Amino acid sequence: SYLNHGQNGIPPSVTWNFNAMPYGKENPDTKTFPIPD
Amino acid sequence: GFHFQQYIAMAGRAINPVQWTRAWRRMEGKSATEVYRDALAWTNNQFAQISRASQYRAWWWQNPLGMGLVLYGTYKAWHMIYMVRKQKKTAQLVAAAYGQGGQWLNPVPR
């Protein structure tokens, strides 16, 4: 009976944040194809 | 150049409010053409005094560069009093809006 003394949802499996987004003029994590001049 | 003290005194009288009422009374029966002609005549009288008296008279500030130095000094005073003040204000404005040097930032990279 003590198994039901305390289930809204669950904790998130993964999280995404702003610092995970890349930035940089030279950083190749932002370069897919060259932008025309 | 000459009569800088008189010019300072003129500015003082102009800022004095009582002189505002005096000028309001003097402007009774007066035209914009007359006012403009009077101001232009005053300026011409100053410059003509200079042109005439520089031929034979020397002021206390006479120097091997003549009135060029007095004119440069007038310009430098104007600069430091007005333009550098405006620069200070603009600097504080830019530093509050974008950060120091924000007006010289490079465009956002693409």
Ligand SMILES: CCCCCCCCCCCCCCCCCC(=O)OC[C@H](COP(=O)([O-])OCC(O)COP(=O)([O-])OC[C@@H](COC(=O)CCCCCCCCCCCCCCCCC)OC(=O)CCCCCCCCCCCCCCCCC)OC(=O)CCCCCCCCCCCCCCCCC
């Ligand atoms: C601080 C300087 C730096 C300024 C900021 C930086 C700017 C750099 C750019 C410079 C550009 C200069 C502008 C050039 C344009 C032409 C200007 C010009 O020739 O006519 C000026 C003008 C002269 O008018 P004028 O048409 O030739 O007619 C002359 C009269 O007939 C009278 O006839 P007179 O024969 O009896 O005398 C003729 C003449 C005689 O002028 C002279 O020959 C100078 C006599 C002394 C020789 C050594 C000069 C330098 C060292 C002593 C003076 C220190 C002050 C610096 C003065 C710089 C100008 C030389 O009279 C004067 O000019 C008096 C000036 C000295 C006033 C002293 C006031 C002391 C208060 C400040 C505390 C002490 C100083 C603190 C330390 C500052 C260090 C930077 O001088 C005035 O300022 C008129 C004052 C009217 C009364 C105002 C109420 C009193 C307030 C006193 C301060 C007045 C403003 C001066 C500010 C400087 C002191 C803080």
